[PDB]
């Protein structure tokens, strides 16, 4: 896989963000994770965590997987990086997202995220408290 440039347009919630990608506005949904909705427990904390991570970043990148690049709602499906740190993995490592929606052939980073979830579970963080 490879990282491509994007710029933040706007934070949305824990697992969606609006980025400009190849000069066009798009909503991205973060691969292989599920944050709580804003109206659910830890939803606001998840939203805040992703917002801080993407707004503070000097460089955002979007990394597509091998499979579909858009979902049925027209959202881009990617791993997103903020100054080289993966947002998807960071949300999981902090107990703010579960590994989820693992579809065949868009799952390159599955085991990396599962290792992060296991550690957030051990530390009984947030969702795992
Ligand atoms: C993360 C992800 C979500 N989706 C679809 C599945 C779910 O459909 P349904 O809307 O039919 O439940 C939905 C969950 O996204 P949200 O968690 O953003 O609601 O998005 C994909 O198709 N591919 C993906 O990789
Ligand atoms: Ca969600």
CA distances from residue 121 to 8, 46, 116, 128 in whole angstroms, order as listed:
30, 16, 9, 6
98 — phi, psi (to 5°)? -100, 150
- State which of 101, 102, 106 you would mutate to test the pocket of ligand 1, scoring each by most atoms of that ligand within 8 A of its C-beta: 101
> Which residue, among 80, 115, 78, 81, has the nearest Cα to 99 in the 3D structure?
115
- In whole angstroms, give the CA distance from residue 87 to residue 91: 6
> Which residue, among 103, 101, 99, 121, has the nearest Cα to 111 in the 3D structure?
99
**Ligand 1 in contact with 98 (CB < 6 A)?**
no
Whose Cα sits closest to atom 7 in ligand 1? 101
66 — phi, psi (to 5°)? -80, -15
83 is an annotated ligand-binding site residue = no
| 3-state SS assignment for residue 101 | coil
Atom of ligand 1 nearest to the CA of 15: 18
Tell me the DSSP string of 102-121. --TTS-TTHHHHHHHHHHHH
- In whole angstroms, give the CA distance from residue 115 to residue 121: 10
Q: What is the bridge-based pairing of β-strands 76-82 and 24-30?
A: parallel
Q: Are 17 and 75 in contact (CB under 8 A)?
A: no
- In whole angstroms, give the CA distance from residue 95 to residue 85: 16
Handedness of CA 110, 7, 36, 117 (dihedral sign): positive
- In whole angstroms, give the CA distance from residue 55 to residue 26: 16
Catalytic residue ranges: 29, 37, 75
Q: What is the bridge-based pairing of β-strands 24-30 and 16-21?
A: antiparallel
| 3-state SS assignment for residue 45 | helix
Q: Write down all domains in the chain, each with its CATH number in brackets.
A: 1-129 (2.40.50.90)
Per DSSP (E only), the strands in the chain are 3-13, 16-21, 24-30, 33-34, 60-63, 76-82, 85-86, 98-99
């Amino acid at each position: 896989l490879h990282k491509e440039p994007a710029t933040l347009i706007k934070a949305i919630d824990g697992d969606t963000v609006k980025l400009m990608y190849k000069g066009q506005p798009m909503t991205f949904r973060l691969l292989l994770v599920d944050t709580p909705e804003f109206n659910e427990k830890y939803g606001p904390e998840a939203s805040a965590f992703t917002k801080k991570m993407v707004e503070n970043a000097k460089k955002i990148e979007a990394e597509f997987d091998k499979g579909q690049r858009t979902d049925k709602y027209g959202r881009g499906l990617a791993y997103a990086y903020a100054d080289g740190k993966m947002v998807n993995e960071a949300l999981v490592r902090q107990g703010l997202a579960k590994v989820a929606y693992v579809y065949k052939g868009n799952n390159t980073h599955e085991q990396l995220l599962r290792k992060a979830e296991a550690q957030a579970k051990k530390e009984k963080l947030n969702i795992w408290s």
